[PDB]
Design a protein around this ligand. Structure first.
Ligand SMILES: [Mg+2]
Ligand SMILES: [Mg+2]
Ligand SMILES: [Mg+2]
Length: 297
DNA sequence: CGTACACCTGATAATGGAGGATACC
DNA sequence: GGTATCCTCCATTAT
DNA sequence: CAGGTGTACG
């Protein structure tokens, strides 16, 4: 387990796992008829709770860490004042690079409006609803019916987004990457199974450009599409690239969260493979046991 | 024998919401 | 009253 | 996120 936090790592992690949300709830007690709330949220498996704790401390002890689902916890900041004072200045200096950036810049604009209390104003609210419409899944049915006049504000959409620091990658992969160990059944290998190591990152196709630039950035790998939908894998299967490129990279720029343990086990598997012990029965069982302990606690 | 890119599919916690209660001015 | 935050729970799909 | 397979190639 690893919870040392660096700004760029946090940004990578938030690009992987965070959400910038705007809620506009109907409620007769508010003059406009609507309550406007802005929320910054990161949800993880409960095995990474310690990571949410380091994140809270990273952001000045602000926010709340709460049970989200069956085996997950949420870290959330929902105080307008608090979002403006620390969250915005952080992400203005250390900018997101995925499509999450677009949600961020919209979310930032609603906060600018909330800062001058324009959300408590009919025209202010309409402008916020226009913003909400281009954030995440956009307008609810109830909001669309309540403001059927409103033109979504254009989704900003950046240009060549280029990996800003090695720690960014560290954080990003700590969220949406994986270090895979496979045992493939083989008829040519004496021992009956091929030990294969795979480094992989998964992301929605809308971030194809970023995904493609990982091939230059790391000097290896390739992209594939999931035939079942819009979802891309950056993948390294070449064991020379794993040892010469990926393993050294994440030895310097460290995985955060419980996935650090997994990278460490994956490395041990790579050592057994380096020494060629994976083609003996004992080395194969060593990998099976390292393989089964992985992603646990 | 052994490896590696192209292709395949399962699991489930995230992704991104929601509703009700209460604090605060 | 008006407004701002806390607290608990969830269905579909990006991991 | 994660576990596999088919098969060309040295
Ligand atoms: Mg993600
Ligand atoms: Mg994750
Ligand atoms: Mg998951």
């Amino acid at each position: 387990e690893n919870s040392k936090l660096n700004p760029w790592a946090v940004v990578g992690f938030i690009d992987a796992e965070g959400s910038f949300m705007v809620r506009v709830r109907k409620n007769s007690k508010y003059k406009t008829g609507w309550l406007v709330v802005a929320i910054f949220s990161v949800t993880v498996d409960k095995k990474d709770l310690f990571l949410l704790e380091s994140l809270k401390t990273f952001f000045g002890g602000l926010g709340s860490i709460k049970k989200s689902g069956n085996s997950t916890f949420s870290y959330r900041i929902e105080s307008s004042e608090q979002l403006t004072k620390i969250i915005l200045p952080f992400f203005d200096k250390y900018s997101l690079i995925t499509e999450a950036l677009g949600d961020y810049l919209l979310f930032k604009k609603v906060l600018e409006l909330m800062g001058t209390k324009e959300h408590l104003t009919q025209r202010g609210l309409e402008k916020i609803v226009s913003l909400k419409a281009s954030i995440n899944k956009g307008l609810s049915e109830e909001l669309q019916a309540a403001f059927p006049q409103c033109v979504p504000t254009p989704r900003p959409e950046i240009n060549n987004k280029n990996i800003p620091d090695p720690f960014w990658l560290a954080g990003f992969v700590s969220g949406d990457g994986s270090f895979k160990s496979i045992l493939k059944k083989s008829e040519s290998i004496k021992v009956g199974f091929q030990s294969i190591l795979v480094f992989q990152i998964t992301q929605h196709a809308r971030d194809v450009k970023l995904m493609e630039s990982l091939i230059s950035y790391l000097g290896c790998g390739f992209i594939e599409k999931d035939s079942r939908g819009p979802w891309l894998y950056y993948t390294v299967t070449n064991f020379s690239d794993i040892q010469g490129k990926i393993i050294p990279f994440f030895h310097q720029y460290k995985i955060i969260g419980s996935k650090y343990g997994d990278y460490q086990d994956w490395c041990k598997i790579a050592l057994i493979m380096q020494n060629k012990n994976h083609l003996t029965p004992e080395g194969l069982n060593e990998i099976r046991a390292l393989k089964g302990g992985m992603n646990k606690g």
